[PDB]
């Protein structure tokens, strides 16, 4: 049911579908080292991806429903130059007729234009004043459905954001060639990322789109704050989803010193461009592989690893005393040789028992494979102290709302632009 499916291969891009669409790529198109299947497009002329379909699959009907899907990453807009700068990213428009996706300040737009130059637009809007954003500089699954008889709809990560009737529109033509380049951007240093572009000749429903989202989500592999692959031997800042205005911090070194959530988080401001909350506050959490036999640096689910703590540019280890008072017992950072037999083994957990994708959670386990439990925070005398507990596991067993068993990894990225 798929007509175009651009997928990475050995130093090239191919089409999974049985149509053999011609592909040509510019000399300035980049690829991520770890996840090469993601494509980076900079604001230049040579940064071009041309893919040409066949004449038998060119959209030239008037009752033909069709859908598209892709993953997109849009960095932060830093200055006023990006305001009111609607710039195109994908065109299938010839003779002023076709379909086009474009980006504006906090906006992603689908545009259809028939032979009569009638323009229909669907928009997705995300703010930039928020403390922590779910869309800025983070991967987004965008899919668009077009039913010529009822409506055209937008789905962001499988949920409905906007719909507009298109019954008024007449015959819509399409270009034989389809476009990947930043067109109409005044900003000389604005780039995007795009991957997993798929086209279907029918209107997809909620169920199929949710299935596609889950399939392409890579639920079996851990993801960071920016939606990329989690890697070992790299410093990550730490965020608690339920209490995101505090950061991991230390006070004293060793067992007698406790790691806690200190706040509040600071701010980055640009006077009516963005007023986000600082994400580079606190102490880094490096991940060290222990028993994962995989050669690659990618962290997978159920992996058993170790976690370094960077305090005054010195690397310590997570451990807690297994034998102490209560289940919500205090974790600590220790000098790397003096761990002894303290519980240090941590299991990475991304998807649940049923396989439904959720955020990163770490489960402290001992040498004997006994679950100390999920890592989180609990309040002791008004201090949010870090503790590993099986209480989270108990609520998971009871299908209750766990409180604090979810962590988020934030590496330093160029798309955020914060000053360390």
């Amino acid at each position: 049911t798929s007509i175009l499916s651009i997928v990475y291969k050995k130093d090239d891009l191919i089409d999974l579908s049985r149509y053999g669409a011609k592909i040509n790529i510019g000399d300035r198109v980049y690829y991520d080292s770890i996840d090469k299947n993601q494509i980076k497009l900079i604001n230049l002329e040579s940064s071009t991806i041309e893919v040409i379909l066949k004449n038998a699959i060119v959209y030239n009907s008037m009752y033909e429903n069709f859908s598209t899907s892709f993953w997109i990453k849009i960095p932060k807009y830093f200055s006023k130059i990006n305001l009111n700068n609607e710039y195109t990213i994908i065109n299938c428009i010839e003779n002023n007729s076709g379909w086009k996706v474009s980006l504006n300040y906090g906006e992603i737009i689908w545009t259809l234009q028939d032979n009569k130059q009638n323009i229909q637009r669907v928009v997705f809007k995300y703010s930039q004043m928020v403390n922590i954003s779910d869309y800025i500089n983070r991967w987004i699954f965008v899919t668009i459905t077009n039913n010529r008889l009822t409506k055209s709809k937008i789905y962001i990560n499988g949920r409905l954001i906007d719909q507009k009737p298109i019954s008024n529109l007449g015959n819509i033509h399409a270009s034989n060639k389809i476009m990947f380049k930043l067109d109409g951007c005044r900003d000389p240093r604005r780039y995007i990322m795009i991957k997993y572009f798929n086209l279907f000749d029918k209107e997809l429903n909620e169920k199929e789109i949710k299935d596609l989202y889950d399939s392409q989500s890579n639920s079996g592999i851990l993801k960071d704050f920016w939606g990329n692959y989690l890697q070992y031997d790299k410093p990550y800042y730490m965020l608690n989803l339920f209490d995101p205005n505090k950061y991991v911090d230390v006070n004293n070194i060793g067992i007698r010193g406790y790691m806690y959530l200190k706040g509040p988080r600071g701010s980055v401001v640009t006077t009516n461009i963005y007023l986000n909350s600082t994400l580079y506050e606190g102490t880094k959490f490096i991940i060290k592989k222990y028993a994962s036999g995989n050669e690659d640096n990618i962290v997978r689910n159920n992996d058993r690893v170790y976690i370094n703590v960077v305090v005054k540019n010195k690397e310590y280890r997570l451990a807690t005393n297994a034998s102490q008072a209560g289940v919500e017992k205090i974790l600590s950072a220790l000098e790397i040789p003096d761990v002894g037999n303290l519980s240090q083994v941590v299991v990475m957990k991304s998807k649940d028992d049923q396989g439904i994708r959720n955020k990163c959670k770490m489960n402290l386990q001992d040498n004997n494979g006994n679950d100390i439990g999920f890592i989180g925070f609990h309040l002791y005398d008004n201090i949010a102290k870090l503790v590993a507990s099986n209480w989270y596991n108990r609520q998971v067993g009871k299908a209750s709302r766990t409180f604090g068993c979810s962590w988020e990894f934030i590496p330093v990225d160029d798309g955020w632009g914060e000053s360390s």
Partner: protein, 592 residues
């Protein structure tokens, strides 16, 4: 019917005078004088507390405007409610009973407010304390008067106004001796902090407790017993007075000759009792506005209202204007530096009262600097770095920040007025109030000194009024003092320096006190013994309401002109004096 009641009341008044003349003046009267003086010193103290603690409480409880102004005028709304309520209740329950209950309420809620952390809670506590201390002046004057013979009533009642002065002197001295020690940071509970102004509040509560202690050892006034049909214990109280007096004199052998006393003939449960009390008090109130007392009561309303309005207006106005003049001098001394360009260099310094304009600082780091009333205008900071910065009354208006970092600074978002920040980060912001809270330092000593001088100015008038009240008369003294107050009000313009305001404050305070004395004596003397506390307390409540209105009005006009306060004060006092000359003469009469 009415004639019979009038005859009975007159007979009781005449015989009561006779019994008091027999008992005589001596130790009993002086003992009661000291006790009731403490009760009045408490009310003297209570009117200074919030004004002395507001400079510290504004920082300690994050007090905005429309909150400082209210806390100021709260001791007066509470006194307004309390005066009426306890004055009305004192004629059905007794003077000493109601005095104990009101003083106890005052003491409790002052103690509570000493520890309260919030603002609304502090408002409520300080309102109830005002309610409690509201009923002090009416009960006290009406209570002491019922033990004095007509020979020297004005002289002996006027001495009772020394104590209110003493209360203010106490307040000022304790504020001077306690508040200046800002270091005291007693810690009991991490979330709470105990400063020196709270200690001041506690020590201000003390006088009221001492008042209750003293009062418990005095007897209810015999007159109240006689009106309410209770004959035996009125007899016993009069016997006690006679016994104490004569034993102190040196003749502990003579006998109380009075055997029978004329007494006014008397003609769900909780709710019924409350309704009955309310009905009786309402009756006493309206009987105060009866045919026999309607002219007197309206002249009394006029005199009380006009005097309170003028006095409170000017009393709040003089410190206001002194602060205004200080401000003007400070603003005159301000230094200006228009334009300066700075390259890589470290800046530590402390600047006070400065304006830097058109600055251009490029990659400058600001470590460990204190700003007091320093404004940066039309400046450009680029790759700057602010660390360990504490600022009072500091603003950045029309400034542009580029790639600057504010680390460990209390530069909140209200100190950047119409600024433009680009790629700027705020890290580890210091704890402070969301809005400007201003700052008061070394200038509190002079505030305490000024208060002290106000009270001391009051002293000569008290002495002279007490000595001449019976020789001259209440109407003459009231008039002669209100007129001089009006003249003093006219002389206000011949003052624009701080020293001038201090001298003028002293003059006005020294002049108005005799008028206030005379109006206290007159108001006691002019009402029957079954309505004295009710009437006195309704007039005192009116006094407090006038205080609220005059404080508001006269503080509204500070720094605007010196014509509005002079005109308002002079007009009010002239009308007060005019109305006072139309009141009936009460000297050389039995207390009826």
């Amino acid at each position: 019917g009415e004639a019979q009641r009038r005859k009975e009341r007159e007979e009781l008044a005449q015989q009561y005078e006779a019994i008091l003349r027999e008992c005589g003046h001596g130790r009993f009267q002086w003992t009661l004088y000291f006790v009731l003086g403490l009760a009045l010193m408490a009310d003297g103290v209570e009117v200074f507390v919030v004004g002395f603690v507001l400079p510290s409480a504004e920082k300690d409880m994050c007090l905005s405007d429309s909150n400082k102004g209210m806390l100021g005028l709260i001791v007066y709304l509470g006194m307004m409610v309390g005066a009426f309520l306890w004055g009305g209740l004192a004629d059905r329950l007794g003077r000493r009973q109601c005095l104990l209950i009101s003083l106890s309420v005052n003491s409790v809620f002052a103690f509570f407010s000493s520890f309260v952390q919030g603002y609304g809670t502090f408002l409520f506590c300080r309102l109830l304390s005002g309610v409690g201390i509201g009923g002090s002046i009416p009960i006290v004057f009406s209570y002491f008067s019922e033990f004095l013979a007509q020979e020297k009533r004005g002289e002996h009642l006027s001495w009772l106004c020394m104590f209110w002065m003493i209360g203010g002197v106490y307040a000022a001295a304790m504020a001077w001796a306690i508040i200046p020690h800002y270091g005291w940071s007693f810690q009991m509970g991490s979330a709470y902090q105990f400063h020196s102004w709270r200690v001041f509040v506690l020590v201000c509560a003390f006088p009221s407790v001492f008042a209750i202690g003293a009062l418990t050892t005095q007897p209810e006034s015999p007159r109240f017993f006689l009106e309410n049909g209770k004959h035996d214990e009125a007899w016993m109280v009069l016997k006690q007075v006679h016994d104490t007096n004569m034993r102190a004199k040196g003749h502990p052998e003579r006998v109380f000759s009075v055997t029978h006393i004329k007494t006014i003939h008397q003609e769900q449960r909780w709710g019924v009792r409350a309704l009955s009390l309310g009905g009786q008090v309402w009756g006493n109130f309206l009987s105060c506005f009866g045919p026999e007392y309607r002219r007197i009561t309206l002249m009394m309303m006029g005199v009380w209202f006009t005097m309170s309005f003028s006095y409170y207006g000017l009393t709040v106005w003089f410190p206001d204007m002194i602060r205004h003049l200080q401000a003007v001098d400070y603003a005159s001394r301000t230094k200006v530096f228009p334009g300066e360009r700075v390259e890589h260099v470290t800046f530590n310094f402390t600047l006070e009262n400065q304006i830097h304009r058109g600055g251009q600082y490029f990659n400058d780091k600001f470590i460990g600097l204190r700003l007091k009333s320093v404004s940066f205008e039309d400046s450009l900071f680029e790759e700057c770095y602010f660390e360990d910065v504490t600022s009072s009354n500091t603003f950045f208006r029309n400034c542009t920040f580029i790639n600057t970092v504010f680390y460990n600074t209390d530069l909140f978002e209200y100190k950047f007025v119409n600024s433009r920040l680009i790629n700027s980060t705020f890290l580890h912001n210091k704890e402070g109030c969301p809005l400007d809270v201003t700052g008061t330092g070394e200038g509190a000593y002079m505030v305490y000194f000024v208060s002290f001088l106000g009270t001391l100015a009051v002293l000569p008038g008290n002495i002279v009024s007490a000595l001449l009240m019976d020789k001259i008369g209440r109407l003459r003294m009231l008039a002669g003092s209100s007129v001089m107050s009006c003249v003093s009000c006219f002389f206000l313009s011949f003052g624009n320096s701080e020293s001038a305001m201090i001298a003028l404050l002293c003059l006005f305070g020294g002049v108005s006190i005799a008028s206030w004395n005379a109006l206290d004596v007159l108001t006691v003397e002019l009402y029957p013994s079954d309505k004295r506390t009710t009437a006195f307390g309704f007039l005192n409540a009116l006094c407090k309401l006038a205080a609220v209105l005059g404080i508001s009005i006269f503080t509204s006009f500070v720094g605007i002109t010196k014509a509005a306060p002079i005109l308002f004060a002079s007009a009010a006092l002239a009308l007060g004096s005019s109305l006072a000359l139309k009141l009936p003469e009460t000297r050389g009469q039995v207390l009826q």
